[PDB]
Amino acid sequence: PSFNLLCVGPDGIGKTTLMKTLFNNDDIEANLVKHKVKIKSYESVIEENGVKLNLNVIDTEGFGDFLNNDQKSWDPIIKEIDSRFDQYLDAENKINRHSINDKRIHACLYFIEPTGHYLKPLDLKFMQSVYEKCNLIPVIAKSDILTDEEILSFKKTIMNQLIQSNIELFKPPLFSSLPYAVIGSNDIVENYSGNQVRGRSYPWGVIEVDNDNHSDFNLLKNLLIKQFMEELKERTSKILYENYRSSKL
Amino acid sequence: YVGFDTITNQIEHRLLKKGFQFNIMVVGQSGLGKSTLINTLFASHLIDSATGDDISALPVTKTTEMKISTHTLVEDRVRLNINVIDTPGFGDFIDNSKAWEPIVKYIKEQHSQYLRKELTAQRERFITDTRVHAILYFLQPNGKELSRLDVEALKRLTEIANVIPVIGKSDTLTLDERTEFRELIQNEFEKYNFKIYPYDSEELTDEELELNRSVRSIIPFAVVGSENEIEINGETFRGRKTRWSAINVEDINQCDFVYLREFLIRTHLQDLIETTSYIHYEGFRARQLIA
Numbered sequence: 244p245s246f247n248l249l250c251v252g253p254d255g256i257g258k259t260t261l262m263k264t265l266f267n268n269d270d271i272e273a274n275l276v277k278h279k280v281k282i283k284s285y286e287s288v289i290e291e292n293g294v295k296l297n298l299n300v301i302d303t304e305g306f307g308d309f310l311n312n313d314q315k316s317w318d319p320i321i322k323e324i325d326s327r328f329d330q331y332l333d334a335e336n337k338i339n340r341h342s343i344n345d346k347r348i349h350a351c352l353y354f355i356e357p358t359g360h361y362l363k364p365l366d367l368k369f370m371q372s373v374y375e376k377c378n379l380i381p382v383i384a385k386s387d388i389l390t391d392e393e394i395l396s397f398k399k400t401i402m403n404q405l406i407q408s409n410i411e412l413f414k415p416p417l418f419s420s421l422p423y424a425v426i427g428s429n430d431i432v433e434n435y436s437g438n439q440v441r442g443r444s445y446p447w448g449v450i451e452v453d454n455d456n457h458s459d460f461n462l463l464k465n466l467l468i469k470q471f472m473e474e475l476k477e478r479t480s481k482i483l484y485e486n487y488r489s490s491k492l
Numbered sequence: 493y494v495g496f497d498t499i500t501n502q503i504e505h506r507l508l509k510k511g512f513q514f515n516i517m518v519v520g521q522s523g524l525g526k527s528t529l530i531n532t533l534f535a536s537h538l539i540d541s542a543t544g545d546d547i548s549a550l551p552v553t554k555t556t557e558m559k560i561s562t563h564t565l566v567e568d569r570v571r572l573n574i575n576v577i578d579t580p581g582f583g584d585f586i587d588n589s590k591a592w593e594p595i596v597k598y599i600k601e602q603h604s605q606y607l608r609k610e611l612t613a614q615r616e617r618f619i620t621d622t623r624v625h626a627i628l629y630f631l632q633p634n635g636k637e638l639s640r641l642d643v644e645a646l647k648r649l650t651e652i653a654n655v656i657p658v659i660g661k662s663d664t665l666t667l668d669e670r671t672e673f674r675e676l677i678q679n680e681f682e683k684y685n686f687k688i689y690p691y692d693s694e695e696l697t698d699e700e701l702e703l704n705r706s707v708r709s710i711i712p713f714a715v716v717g718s719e720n721e722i723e724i725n726g727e728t729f730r731g732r733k734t735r736w737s738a739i740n741v742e743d744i745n746q747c748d749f750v751y752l753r754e755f756l757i758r759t760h761l762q763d764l765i766e767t768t769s770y771i772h773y774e775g776f777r778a779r780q781l782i783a
């Protein structure tokens with residue numbers, strides 16, 4: 244029961260908070276296994292769908308925080324993806340394969356800053372170099388600051404950019420509401436009816452994580468965990484990994 | 493009764509027919525509410541977003557460019573000629589190692605232009621003052637320490653102009669995240685020892701230094717901007733309304749916009765203009781003359 248998730252976004256964008264929020268467990272970053280971006284790999288055991296879930300969250304430190312964010316800066320991201328393909332390919336070729344540690348990355352969440360305008364050249368360059376190796380899932384981070392109209396206009400601009408760069412998002416065999424406008428909070432707050440809920444409290448209101456009227460969080464949760472986790476792993480295995488191995492020979 | 497206390501009336505009447513120049517610059521990455529904040533401070537739609545929703549609008553040279561617009565506002569009898577300077581392309585490119593160099597060039601160019609007139613044998617009585625009087629530096633509300641780009645940009649801009657830090661889109665933060673972030677950035681300012689406006693002058697009184705202390709305690713301002721009026725229970729005010737929130741921009745219990753407006757415009761507006769003269773322009777002029 245393994246699952247490997249990649250989180251690419253600038254520091255402070257909300258990657259850690261969304262991981263704790265999705266899997267409802269604060270120990271996502273309790274176990275760190277060991278100008279360039281650093282790669283941080285976290286291994287946690289999650290009680291999701293009754294069974295133990297061997298979740299592996301791969302995180303980035305310092306993405307987009309150099310004066311020059313060219314490919315050499317964020318190349319450790321791709322080197323790690325290709326390496327997890329390489330490890331599986333070698334272990335798959337051995338006589339005794341039976342409990343392969345499948346470290347292949349099954350989904351790549353790309354965190355978009357809630358600018359409300361457009362994707363930056365760095366956003367397009369990285370996603371242009373990841374969509375053929377991972378299941379790419381773009382999200383609008385901290386989307387609570389955006390009005391209802393800004394989210395629609397922002398999504399429309401973002402999709403036209405990905406389409407014009409021939410960037411291929413993950414399509415559930417949900418796809419139209421991409422990129423997902425998500426919020427993150429595994430913390431309990433009290434709303435204007437006095438009820439204990441997850442979310443964030445402000446002078447101007449209380450936003451609720453598990454509220455479909457406030458975000459797309461449940462859409463991302465369904466896509467990642469509760470509905471389409473199997474097809475995410477399938478596309479990695481049957482297509483993304485096979486295309487990598489073929490062009491390697 | 494002689495009547496020389498009338499002299500302040502004679503001066504005000506002379507300056508009212510003259511007008512007043514204010515040159516303000518906004519620095520920050522696109523999408524931080526910079527054009528919205530300028531349009532909210534002056535209660536008028538002065539500028540559009542320097543890039544908008546079109547990424548093809550970014551400077552083709554792949555560097556920061558100056559976008560200067562000029563405006564005029566009237567209140568009763570005071571006319572205010574406003575120059576707004578946006579910086580499209582700052583921090584928006586893959587390589588931002590020279591993101592601040594066109595900004596530093598523009599600031600020095602205005603001093604150079606002014607000094608070129610002060611040295612002529614036949615000076616004009618009213619030199620056009622295009623010197624940058626204030627810089628609103630927009631920081632992202634991400635709770636992180638100053639990035640390399642912010643350190644490099646601020647370490648130069650804070651030495652040539654009155655830099656006013658501002659947390660753009662500060663409604664991202666809860667009040668506790670606001671306290672922790674503002675306290676972190678202030679410690680960053682102490683760590684790098686930046687000269688952050690306002691300055692303390694010996695000409696200031698004990699009450700003026702106290703005003704400087706209180707305003708300084710909430711810098712960078714946690715601003716929220718909006719040109720659009722919203723309605724909440726019949727009451728109409730300008731702000732933002734969403735599926736879960738309703739922000740009143742002019743509510744001091746929600747953000748620091750009102751404090752920023754009193755500061756930038758109602759108490760330190762003339763101080764900003766004059767400090768550009770006797771501090772920044774004089775410092776520039778002194779270095780040109782010695783060489």
Ligand SMILES: Nc1nc2c(ncn2[C@@H]2O[C@H](COP(=O)(O)OP(=O)(O)OP(=O)(O)O)[C@@H](O)[C@H]2O)c(=O)[nH]1
Binds near residue numbers: 261387443635664669
């Ligand atoms: N407005 C808003 N703020 C959020 C949201 N999610 C997280 N935050 C805040 O954003 C800040 C960044 O949270 P993190 O998840 O720790 O940031 P990160 O992506 O992990 O980046 P690093 O801290 O450098 O590891 C935190 O202070 C959170 O309180 C959100 O959905 N909306």
Ligand SMILES: Nc1nc2c(ncn2[C@@H]2O[C@H](COP(=O)(O)OP(=O)(O)O)[C@@H](O)[C@H]2O)c(=O)[nH]1
Binds near residue numbers: 521523663718
């Ligand atoms: N949450 C929030 N959003 C804002 C604020 N000010 C502006 N925005 C939104 O952010 C988007 C970009 O703002 P804009 O002023 O054009 O950014 P600019 O590129 O710096 O000029 C717009 O759609 C605004 O509606 C603010 O104070 N808070």
Ligand SMILES: [Mg+2]
Binds near residue numbers: 258259
């Ligand atoms: Mg983190």
Ligand code: NA
Binds near residue numbers: 278308309
């Ligand atoms: Na650097």
Ligand code: NA
Binds near residue numbers: 312314368
């Ligand atoms: Na590049």
Ligand code: NA
Binds near residue numbers: 356523524
């Ligand atoms: Na932002």
Ligand code: NA
Binds near residue numbers: 364554585586587
């Ligand atoms: Na570029």
Ligand code: NA
Binds near residue numbers: 592593596648
């Ligand atoms: Na310079």
Ligand code: NA
Binds near residue numbers: 597598601
């Ligand atoms: Na210039």
